[PDB]
Amino acid sequence: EVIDKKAFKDMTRNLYPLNPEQVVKLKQIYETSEYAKAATPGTPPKPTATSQFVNLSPGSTPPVIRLSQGFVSSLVFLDSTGAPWPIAAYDLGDPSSFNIQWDKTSNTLMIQATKLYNYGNLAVRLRGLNTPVMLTLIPGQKAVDYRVDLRVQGYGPNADLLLHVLEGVPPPGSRRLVVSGGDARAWLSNEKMYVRTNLTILSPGWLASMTSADGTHAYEMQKSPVLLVSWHGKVMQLKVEG
Amino acid sequence: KTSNTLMIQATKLYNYGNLAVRLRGLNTPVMLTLIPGQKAVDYRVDLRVQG
Amino acid sequence: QQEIQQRTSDMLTAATQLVQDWKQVETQVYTEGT
Amino acid sequence: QQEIQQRTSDMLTAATQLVQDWKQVETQVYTEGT
Amino acid sequence: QQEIQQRTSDMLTAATQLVQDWKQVETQVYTEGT
Amino acid sequence: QQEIQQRTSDMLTAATQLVQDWKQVETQVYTEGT
Amino acid sequence: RIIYYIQAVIPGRAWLIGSNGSTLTVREGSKIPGYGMVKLIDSLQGRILTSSGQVIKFSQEDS
Amino acid sequence: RIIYYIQAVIPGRAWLIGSNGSTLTVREGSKIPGYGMVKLIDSLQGRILTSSGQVIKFSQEDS
Amino acid sequence: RIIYYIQAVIPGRAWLIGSNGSTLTVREGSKIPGYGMVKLIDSLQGRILTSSGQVIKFSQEDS
Amino acid sequence: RIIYYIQAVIPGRAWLIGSNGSTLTVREGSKIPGYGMVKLIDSLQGRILTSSGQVIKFSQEDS
Numbered sequence: 039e040v041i042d043k044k045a046f047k048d049m050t051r052n053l054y055p056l057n058p059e060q061v062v063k064l065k066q067i068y069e070t071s072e073y074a075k076a077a078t079p080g081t082p083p084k085p086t087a088t089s090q091f092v093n094l095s096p097g098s099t100p101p102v103i104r105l106s107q108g109f110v111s112s113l114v115f116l117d118s119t120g121a122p123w124p125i126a127a128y129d130l131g132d133p134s135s136f137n138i139q140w141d142k143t144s145n146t147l148m149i150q151a152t153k154l155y156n157y158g159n160l161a162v163r164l165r166g167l168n169t170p171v172m173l174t175l176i177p178g179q180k181a182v183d184y185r186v187d188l189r190v191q192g193y194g195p196n197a198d199l200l201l202h203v204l205e206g207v208p209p210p211g212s213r214r215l216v217v218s219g220g221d222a223r224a225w226l227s228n229e230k231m232y233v234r235t236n237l238t239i240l241s242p243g244w245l246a247s248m249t250s251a252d253g254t255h256a257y258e259m260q261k262s263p264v265l266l267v268s269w270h271g272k273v274m275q276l277k278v279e280g
Numbered sequence: 281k282t283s284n285t286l287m288i289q290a291t292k293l294y295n296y297g298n299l300a301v302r303l304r305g306l307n308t309p310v311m312l313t314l315i316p317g318q319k320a321v322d323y324r325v326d327l328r329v330q331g
Numbered sequence: 332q333q334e335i336q337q338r339t340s341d342m343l344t345a346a347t348q349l350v351q352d353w354k355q356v357e358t359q360v361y362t363e364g365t
Numbered sequence: 366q367q368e369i370q371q372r373t374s375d376m377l378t379a380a381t382q383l384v385q386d387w388k389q390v391e392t393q394v395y396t397e398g399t
Numbered sequence: 400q401q402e403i404q405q406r407t408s409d410m411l412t413a414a415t416q417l418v419q420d421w422k423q424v425e426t427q428v429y430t431e432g433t
Numbered sequence: 434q435q436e437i438q439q440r441t442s443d444m445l446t447a448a449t450q451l452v453q454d455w456k457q458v459e460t461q462v463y464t465e466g467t
Numbered sequence: 468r469i470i471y472y473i474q475a476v477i478p479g480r481a482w483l484i485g486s487n488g489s490t491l492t493v494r495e496g497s498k499i500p501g502y503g504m505v506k507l508i509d510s511l512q513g514r515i516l517t518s519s520g521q522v523i524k525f526s527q528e529d530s
Numbered sequence: 531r532i533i534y535y536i537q538a539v540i541p542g543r544a545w546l547i548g549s550n551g552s553t554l555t556v557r558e559g560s561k562i563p564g565y566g567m568v569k570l571i572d573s574l575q576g577r578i579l580t581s582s583g584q585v586i587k588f589s590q591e592d593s
Numbered sequence: 594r595i596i597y598y599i600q601a602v603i604p605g606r607a608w609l610i611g612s613n614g615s616t617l618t619v620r621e622g623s624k625i626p627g628y629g630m631v632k633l634i635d636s637l638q639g640r641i642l643t644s645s646g647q648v649i650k651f652s653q654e655d656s
Numbered sequence: 657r658i659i660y661y662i663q664a665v666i667p668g669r670a671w672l673i674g675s676n677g678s679t680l681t682v683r684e685g686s687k688i689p690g691y692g693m694v695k696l697i698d699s700l701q702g703r704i705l706t707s708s709g710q711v712i713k714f715s716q717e718d719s
Contacts, residue, residue, distance in 0.1 A: 055376040281432035
């Protein structure tokens with residue numbers, strides 16, 4: 039009668055030759071093997087964004103664009119006024135390494151470096167530009183750029199910071215300032231205090247003020263170590279240091 | 281075709297990638313990078329625009 | 332003592348038969364009416 | 366000591382039959398209706 | 400000592416598989432809508 | 434002393450594979466617009 | 468000072484976000500203000516060592 | 531004074547950009563103001579020595 | 594004390610809703626106020642063992 | 657007090673309709689008021705045994 043149980047356990051071992059713990063172990067082994075076999079050797083490049091000028095003198099060095107394998111290289115062309123100057127026609131040497139995605143009416147260019155260590159060159163005629171503008175490109179560099187802005191010498195056919203402060207961007211040339219008892223931030227940029235809050239100041243006045251819909255305020259003012267703030271009908275005094 | 285939303289999926293486990301988006305009101309396109317296989321999964325990504 | 336394997340063999344495909352029966356799954360039927 | 370090769374063969378079939386399952390992955394499907 | 404050559408052969412087949420899985424690279428894509 | 438010939442032969446096959454690819458170089462492209 | 472959280476980490480490169488909403492990326496050989504020199508990067512278990520004896524990780528609740 | 535950086539590096543050609551914003555491409559044998567004579571251009575790791583003992587390299591931010 | 598109920602438990606992660614509705618997801622290595630550290634989480638049998646010698650379990654009607 | 661009738665019985669769970677209209681389902685590990693603790697649930701012959709010496713079954717006329 040134990041022959042049936044022996045047949046059951048032998049049949050179970052023949053049907054499943056592995057323990058479940060062995061199954062999960064080899065699954066982790068497969069995950070590690072996949073991770074190593076599709077790991078990327080070498081130091082990866084740093085993704086960046088660049089803006090340069092186009093030198094149209096007859097003795098300048100042409101600009102070189104750093105590329106990556108299978109990654110987007112987007113170029114945006116502007117004039118000296120910064121206005122978008124769209125692209126009429128273009129040409130690329132050796133497209134076996136580089137694919138071009140070009141909207142008909144745009145200055146936007148999308149390049150993918152298909153070959154590993156082969157570098158190329160390109161020329162572009164704009165809609166009003168007399169002299170065509172050319173670039174040289176090389177993939178596999180230590181830094182890679184996502185958006186490359188190119189400001190040209192010629193005029194195109196087409197031609198404050200407090201809004202971005204109210205959005206949340208601090209102005210440059212500043213340092214963080216510690217305050218006591220204040221749900222606000224202050225920045226000194228060019229001997230002018232920019233303070234972002236949601237409160238209302240009373241005593242020293244402001245040069246300018248900008249308020250948002252959700253209740254945030256931005257104040258531009260001179261130097262003042264002391265502030266009086268009216269919140270919910272009551273006045274609170276606070277101090278700040280330069 | 282008229283959406284304001286991106287609905288993507290990751291095919292592999294850790295392969296990095298990138299894209300560029302030309303918006304309806306944006307002259308300058310915006311390029312974003314994507315990586316799967318981290319310690320946290322972004323169930324949704326909301327993006328404030330200065331423009 | 333060779334009778335174990337013929338005891339082992341016949342129930343193997345018998346067990347393999349019914350172990351497929353825990354695998355199938357059918358989509359439900361959904362409709363409207365008026 | 367020669368019974369290892371019997372137990373060597375079957376697990377290789379057992380290893381292969383599920384490691385192919387951990388390669389494919391179905392596409393997400395978006396449904397649109399008014 | 401032919402097992403070393405056998406080992407080298409199977410690892411060489413695996414290495415050819417890996418290098419032919421590394422060789423290919425597809426292209427970028429465009430999506431335009433209004 | 435007889436190992437030179439097979440060490441020549443794989444070098445023959447590899448270099449002939451290289452010299453085929455050293456010759457060609459594809460044409461440039463041009464795209465218009467308005 | 469400023470708490471940095473690892474947001475993304477690959478072999479070679481790491482991605483940090485500070486206390487004040489500042490995003491940044493770093494490599495193995497680099498200098499970080501307030502922390503000094505990044506000695507080694509452990510992509511396993513999200514671990515970063517700097518020269519000031521500090522370890523950068525993901526957040527405990529944001530993990 | 532004026533400090534240059536390596537923008538693009540291949541064997542045979544080196545691309546430099548100064549602190550003034552002016553950029554150029556040069557070979558191993560060249561003369562550059564502020565550095566002198568380029569003794570060595572190394573293809574690996576982006577390091578270029580000059581006769582005045584200075585080393586040109588990628589930036590910390592441009593890495 | 595605020596009592597957490599296992600709304601969802603998988604291998605690796607678990608989901609707890611508190612007495613007042615505090616909804617969260619916990620991994621194996623974390624901390625819990627009123628129970629200390631998280632040491633052992635059992636995906637089978639519906640039990641989470643903490644450092645304070647206590648077990649979070651499915652309730653009778655929360656099942 | 658409250659009695660119950662075996663409405664639906666599966667292995668594992670059970671369904672009991674109360675005398676006052678209390679229809680519910682229950683598992684093996686339960687604290688049933690008026691009956692206490694269930695030591696065993698048997699789908700054979702429709703018997704539910706309790707620690708209070710009480711056994712719940714079908715009705716005689718509803719059988």
